[PDB]
Symmetry: none
Subunit: 154 residues, 2 copies
C-alpha cells in the first residue's frame, strides 16, 4: 500500500465529513502560500502526518496535494496521471508547460504544478501524484522520465 494511496484515502474520508467545507476553503486558500506554511490547513493534514517520519519536502508534497485535490474539488480519476491529462488537453503551447514542469526546481514546482492542475479537464490520479512528488527530486530524474513516457505515450 502506497503512501500516495493512503493519503488519498485520508483525503477522501475527509471530504464526506462536515468539516469538508472549512477544510476545502482552507486548502484552496493555502495555494497563496508555500505548502505547510498555512496554519488553517494544518488540522486537516498534521494528524495524518504524525503517523510517519517525514522529511520536510515530503510534508510539503502532502500539503500541496491536498490543496490541488481541493482545487479539483476531490475530483480524483484513478489511472489518469496529470501528464496524460496534460497531453489530452491538445496543443503545442501545452507542450511547453509540460516541459517547464519537468525543469522546475523547489522554488517553482508548487506554482507550476498548481497552474498545470487547474488547466487540465477532468480529474487526475492524486494517489499517483503524491507518490510521484515524493520522489521528484532524485538526481536520476526517474519520475520526470515516466511523465515524459506518459505524456508522449498518449
Amino acid at each position: 500500500m502506497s503512501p500516495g494511496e493512503r493519503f488519498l484515502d485520508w483525503l477522501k474520508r475527509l471530504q464526506g465529513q462536515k468539516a469538508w467545507t472549512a477544510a476545502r476553503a482552507a486548502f484552496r486558500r493555502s495555494l497563496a502560500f508555500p505548502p505547510g506554511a498555512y496554519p488553517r490547513a494544518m488540522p486537516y493534514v498534521e494528524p495524518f502526518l504524525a503517523k510517519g517520519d517525514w522529511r520536510q519536502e515530503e510534508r510539503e508534497a502532502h500539503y500541496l496535494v491536498a490543496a490541488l485535490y481541493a482545487l479539483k474539488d476531490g475530483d480524483h480519476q484513478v489511472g489518469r496521471t496529470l501528464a496524460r491529462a496534460l497531453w489530452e488537453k491538445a496543443s503545442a503551447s501545452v507542450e511547453k508547460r509540460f516541459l517547464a514542469l519537468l525543469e522546475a526546481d523547489r522554488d517553482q514546482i508548487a506554482f507550476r504544478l498548481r497552474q498545470a492542475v487547474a488547466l487540465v479537464e477532468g480529474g487526475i490520479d492524486f494517489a499517483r501524484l503524491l507518490d510521484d512528488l515524493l520522489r521528484w527530486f532524485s538526481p536520476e530524474r526517474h519520475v520526470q522520465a515516466r511523465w515524459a513516457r506518459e505524456y508522449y505515450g498518449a
Copy 2:
C-alpha cells in the same frame, strides 16, 4: 533495420528540417546533464521512443547518441566506427590509446563522460548507427562490444 539504424534515420530527417537548429542546440546543451534528465531535448526524442519498449538504460543510450551526433553536426560515416577513428587519431597522439582504454573500462557512471570526450577527439565522421547499437549492448555480461572494439582498434 537495427535500432541504431532506425534512430540514425530519425536524426537525419530531423536534420533536414527547420527544427534542426533548435534541436542541435538542445542536444548540445544536454551534455551538461545526465542522459534523459534534460527536458528541452525531450520533444525531439520521446516521440521516437514511444513507438518501442525500452529499458531506462536503453532510453539513455539514445539520448547520448543524439547529443553526440549533434556535437558533430551529424557527421556520420557508415563503417567508420568510433574505435577505428580513435585508432586513426592515435597515430598523431599516444595520448589517445590511453583514452580509448579508459573508455573501454567505463562503467555506468563514467561512460557518458568518456564517450563524449572520445567522440570530440576524433576527426571525420563515425558510424552513429553502429554506435547506438553498441551502446545498447555495452553492459552485456560477456562484454561482446568492448571485445569487438578492441579488435577494431588493435586489428588495424
